[model samples]
Target: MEHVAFGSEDIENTLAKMDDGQLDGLAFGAIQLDGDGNILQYNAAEGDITGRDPKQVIGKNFFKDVAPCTDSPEFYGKFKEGVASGNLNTMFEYTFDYQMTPTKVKVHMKKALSGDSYWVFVKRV
Candidate 1:
């Protein structure tokens, strides 16, 4: 069976920490980014789910190195437009080319004034 690059071990560990009641096959991650969308902290869960290592991900831009799909002009354009138009809660479903089959993930957005960056919480479904 195809698996995340991080392998079953890490992805299992990440899901173990989440509430069992939430979802059976879900992984959560805290994605931190700088103003310019530079990746700062991509938690173990994110790396594991995405089949990427922290070392390879850290210091990279989300739209560039990480999930470039989200950074595409079409996707980011709509996202930014929504935020600018007083959109507080953003929700959508998208398929990614990870783990062989398209894995569905949801992204929650919030800005951190103190950190001078945007924090996105992502989870698999």
Candidate 2:
């Protein structure tokens, strides 16, 4: 799958189906999480942008340990809704400014039907 534009439906669909390797190769940040939002896969791009090593993040709670900026209603709330619905493909713009300088970004969260994981895709806006 090619690198689709950030927040595009094509990117969402591709990410929902792609394997770990495919997701890791993506130019943008991609973080795969369990249904409960625990990090299962943290791509290099994500680590680079967030300044957190993947080794330190894998197995941590994404909305808590990795990105507390998203722990609020706007981000994690939408995530919970997606998990319950079983087809989370929501996108929005957000600014992460907790630990570092504020960074504007596009955020996409997707989970395929019957899928057990959620894919969090982020791109600098």
Candidate 3:
């Protein structure tokens, strides 16, 4: 079977190497942001899971506007610092307390080589 599991090491490689169209194929949440952490591509699974009305949040800030809100200090801060250090391929598990569903998810965050793009790959645990 085609494995797209969260804990798979290949998950990082697949998402990192795939294009925007391919990333949109992900069954879990996959959000692509600009280098500045602004929303670029919000995926279907993301909108369905978070229920955050992705349509209105296209240009919003990730740490502030997005409901990855609780642990911005943990992940967002880590994210900014990691990128600033040019070493932003981090995976961590934290509670994703969206408007309705509050669950812990493994966050596979990274930066792309093609451009100054950042990917936020979320898989529910």
Candidate 4:
């Protein structure tokens, strides 16, 4: 059985099974967004890394209210493309301007295992 971890092969399946309720304790930051890019699931580890509590970001537009850095073609574009193709299992490297220090992070974008949502798994480096 594959465990819940960064870069886990087919993490979507693990999530689909039972990882949904345990996101708060996950090592990486799990952020769930809707088709409209609104924040839905904000994990505790995500708050620790980004310094923004769930209350401050939940229901807010991720690209607008939280981190507009991805509003550009690179990050945002890939997400849109994933939406169009109906398969969002894409992973890439990215830098986050979070916490006043540029952080290099591995980003995994995929379709939400349960619903019509999307999940971005951010592995802090």
TM-score of each: 0.62, 0.84, 0.77, 0.87
Say which candidate scores most in lDDT.
2
Q: Note the residue pairs that clash in candidate 4.
A: none
Total clashing pairs for each candidate:
0, 0, 0, 0
Best by TM-score: 4
Q: Evaluate model 3: give its lDDT.
A: 0.71
lDDT of each residue in 20-39, candidate 3, tens digit only: 55655777887877767888
* Candidate 3 Cα errors over 4 Å, as ranges: 1-21, 68-71
Evaluate model 2: give its lDDT.
Answer: 0.80
lDDT of each: 0.56, 0.80, 0.71, 0.79
In model 2, the worst 10-residue window by lDDT is: 1-10
lDDT tens readout by residue for model 1, 1-125: 12232223233334334342332233466566666678766666666666777667779877776777687654566555544553423445666673345677776655543335555656787
Model 1 compared with the native: what TM-score?
0.62
Question: Least accurate stretch of 10 residues (summed lDDT) in model 4?
Answer: 14-23
After superposition, which runs of candidate 2 have C-alpha atoms over 4 Å from their true positions? Answer: 1-4, 8-22
Candidate 3 displacement at residue 76 in angstroms: 0.7
Worst 10 residues of 3 by lDDT: 1-10
Q: What is the lDDT of candidate 4?
A: 0.79
